[PDB]
Design a protein around this ligand. Structure first.
Ligand SMILES: *[C@](O)(C(N)=O)[C@H](CC1CCC1)NC(=O)[C@@H]1[C@@H]2[C@H](CN1C(=O)[C@@H](NC(=O)NC(C)(C)C)C(C)(C)C)C2(C)C
Ligand SMILES: *[C@](O)(C(N)=O)[C@H](CC1CCC1)NC(=O)[C@@H]1[C@@H]2[C@H](CN1C(=O)[C@@H](NC(=O)NC(C)(C)C)C(C)(C)C)C2(C)C
Lengths: 306, 306
């Protein structure tokens, strides 16, 4: 038993990380087949960041200005192109460690693993949720740009995030692997706002299920609610509305525990209205929303990866 | 910026995980050079677990009764021996993915990464602290025995933990890689108690430093304390005593923030006596003790690994 926030094993992604240098800027790239993907602001000086014309800046660069290094070994750059907010560098060698992969656009409320890298060298791995306001709460210092997010389905790596920037209070923003930002952000050092965020209700319920599965059940009560009644409570507490689609997704956890989703909702309602009264659930004194239903099913059933 | 509980990249350890089967029991093994290490209770039936004589049980087994599989490929077992609570299976092939490694005995209050595996297949990675009572709070289902804990110093993997058993409330126990249990535990399904645990004070202070470094500073106050005065407070709250050795270890974080350790102690004292008043620190509503000083320095300075 036990329930922990868990990342995917990172080995398949470690084999794809490279260092990309353009002039004075060193950040990370992702090497898959004969292409290296990295944030396009690798081409910028500090002053360019304030108001960049990326088309004009990239015109000043040639293949030989992009220094790509895979471990100690230099890659030869034979082409370059900009796709949205990423740069793609064509190299003369296919990465012999290329895993089976896809590029996916993750939905708000879903999770992924981040392999934080510096100078093309993997530092550590952690899980993130894509917040409803299209930000993540990660750990990214200067040098981490180009670090990626991913999920692993058996042997296939689905890349979903590349790190670009930070917003006030350690809030992080980035792109899919086609260079499209999640959310309203642009890659310019100028005032920008993230939306109001909201709590991912289906994820809170999944985590309460995880708690019951792990024997932490003090918060279960004699009550029930309706979808409508729960949703009036969700709206007062800045929780996203619960839908029948979410009830259906919670089915495996309802079946494992025998606790109907609307009875677990009545527990959640009492925890929102009354607080935790100094008690903890799965070692937390707050209601946790960064575990998806799949995350709880996968962990509380033991799925693995080749 | 940002501060997250982060595991080491797991690729070097993924390349060492195998499946070990003896009769009806399948669990994980660790393949380094031409040896596979696994928990010795792989040899037990369910009934044997209740009161095993491991010497007598192992005598009934030959090399060809240990089925070792590395991916889809079978290893040949050419010798077996028991060392404390592990079995060592000599195989006829050195693991070609063997990293630079050491076996270390971790101290209480230190952290390590766990690569949770099932059937020899890596499932996920998370960080654990060795509690002062020589247990860990992990996520281990049936099939996870033999999963290991480790740290990475640049390119060298220091293995420190192998998973064996669970105690009430999802508390986990296991051995070093010489098969010596951490704590008082024995590998028998009979009543056993873990000691009273205590909170790792130096780790709480490191995490308050992490909070200040990340701009979360509402809990800083106009007060100071002494080592003696703080320690009377630590004892009332089941915190380990703070020593000058711990003050010295916190030096890099004191220097980064300009906040003397005894001034941060005065903040900790007020948080213990008054609680958090419904506020959070680095996204937590509890005081966190599973980050070492090195963990905070490494993350809040960006150290990486080859
Ligand atoms: C990466 O490029 C990298 N080299 O690692 C970097 C990570 C940050 C963490 C400190 C350096 N990303 C940026 O520097 C990024 C690039 C400029 C400025 N960036 C920011 O993240 C800035 N944020 C920002 O201006 N926020 C708003 C837009 C005002 C809310 C920093 C002030 C953190 C540097 C661009 C192109 C956005
Ligand atoms: C592993 O062997 C494995 N196959 O994965 C297993 C992990 C646990 C998680 C459920 C199965 N470890 C054990 O089964 C372990 C082996 C027997 C019994 N074990 C226990 O962990 C038991 N705990 C226990 O008896 N606790 C005390 C000692 C009474 C406090 C379980 C009841 C969880 C099975 C031995 C040799 C200790």
């Amino acid at each position: 038993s036990g329930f922990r926030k868990m990342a995917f094993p990172s080995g398949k992604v470690e084999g794809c990380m490279v260092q990309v240098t353009c002039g004075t800027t060193t950040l990370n790239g992702l090497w898959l087949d004969d292409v290296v993907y990295c944030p396009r602001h690798v081409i910028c000086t500090s002053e360019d960041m304030l108001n960049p014309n990326y088309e004009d800046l990239l015109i000043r660069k040639s293949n030989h200005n992009f220094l790509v290094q895979a471990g100690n070994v230099q890659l030869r750059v034979i082409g370059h192109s900009m796709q949205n907010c990423v740069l793609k560098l064509k190299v003369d060698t296919a990465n012999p460690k290329t895993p089976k992969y896809k590029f996916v656009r993750i939905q708000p409320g879903q999770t992924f693993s981040v392999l934080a890298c510096y100078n093309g060298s993997p530092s550590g791995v952690y899980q993130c949720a894509m917040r409803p306001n299209f930000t993540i709460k990660g750990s990214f210092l200067n040098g981490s740009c180009g670090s990626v997010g991913f999920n692993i389905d058996y042997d296939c790596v689905s890349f979903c995030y590349m790190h670009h920037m930070e917003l006030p209070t350690g809030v992080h923003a980035g792109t899919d692997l086609e260079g499209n930002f999640y959310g309203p952000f642009v890659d310019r050092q100028t005032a920008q706002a993230a939306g109001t965020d909201t709590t991912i209700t289906v994820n809170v319920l999944a985590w309460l299920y995880a708690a019951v599965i792990n024997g932490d059940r003090w918060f279960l009560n004699r009550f029930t609610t309706t979808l409508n009644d729960f949703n009036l409570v969700a709206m007062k507490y800045n929780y996203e509305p619960l839908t029948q689609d979410h009830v259906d997704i919670l089915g495996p956890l309802s079946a494992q525990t025998g606790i109907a989703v609307l009875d677990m909702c009545a527990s959640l309602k009492e925890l929102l209205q009354n607080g935790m009264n100094g008690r903890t659930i799965l070692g937390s004194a707050l209601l946790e929303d960064e575990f998806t239903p799949f995350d709880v099913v996968r962990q509380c059933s033991g799925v693995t990866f080749q």
